[PDB]
C-alpha cells in the first residue's frame, strides 16, 4: 500500500512527524515487500533514527521480527555501529543470540564491522562469542587483523 511505503520511507528518513501520522496498529509492523521485507523498525534501527526507534517500540513494533533473510532489527543496529539503538533494542527485550538464516548473530555483525563497544554491549547481555554461523565461523573468526582489541574482547583474554 501507498501508506505503508510512506511509513517505511519515513522510518528510513527519520521523519518522526510522518511516522506519527501513518503509524497505526495495522501498519507498525508492515514489511517492505519490494525490498528484503524490512519493517519500519528495521529501517529506523539501520539508519540510526533514534526518535523513530523509540516511537515505534512504544507503539507496538516487534523487536523480534525477522526480515526476508532472517535479520532482526538488532542485526541492523549492530552491523552499522548504532550503539544507542542497539541498547534501546536490548532493553526492550531483543534476543542477543538471535541468528539469521545463515546463523549470523548480531555479534558476528559487530565483530566483522569492527564495533568494539557494541561487541562489549552484546557480551554483557550474554552474547555467545563461540557461536558458529553456517560457514563454521565464530564472531572471533570474522574480526579484522587490525582490531586486536576486539579479538582480545571476544577471546576473553
Amino acid at each position: 500500500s501507498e501508506a505503508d511505503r510512506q511509513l517505511l520511507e519515513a522510518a528510513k528518513a527519520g521523519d518522526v512527524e510522518t511516522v506519527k501520522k501513518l503509524c497505526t496498529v495495522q501498519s507498525v509492523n508492515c514489511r517492505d515487500i519490494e525490498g528484503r521485507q524490512s519493517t519500519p523498525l528495521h529501517f529506523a534501527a539501520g539508519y540510526n533514527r533514534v526518535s523513530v526507534v523509540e516511537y515505534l517500540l512504544q507503539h507496538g513494533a516487534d523487536v523480534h521480527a525477522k526480515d526476508k533473510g532472517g535479520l532482526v532489527p538488532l542485526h541492523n543496529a549492530c552491523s552499522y555501529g548504532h550503539y544507542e539503538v542497539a541498547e534501546l533494542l536490548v532493553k526492550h527485550g531483543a534476543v542477543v543470540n538471535v541468528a539469521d538464516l545463515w546463523k549470523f548473530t548480531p555479534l558476528h555483525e559487530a565483530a566483522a564491522k569492527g564495533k568494539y563497544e557494541i561487541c562489549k554491549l552484546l557480551l554483557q547481555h550474554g552474547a555467545d562469542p563461540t557461536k558458529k554461523n553456517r560457514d563454521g565461523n565464530t564472531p572471533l573468526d570474522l574480526v579484522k587483523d587490525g582490531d586486536t582489541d576486539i579479538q582480545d574482547l571476544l577471546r576473553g583474554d
Binding site: F43, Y47, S79, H82
Partner: peptide, 14 residues
C-alpha cells in the same frame, strides 16, 4: 554469501 545480501541501513548519517 551473495544471496544473504546486506541489512537495510548504513553507518554514517552523512
Amino acid at each position: 554469501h551473495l544471496q544473504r545480501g546486506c541489512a537495510d541501513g548504513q553507518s554514517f548519517r552523512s
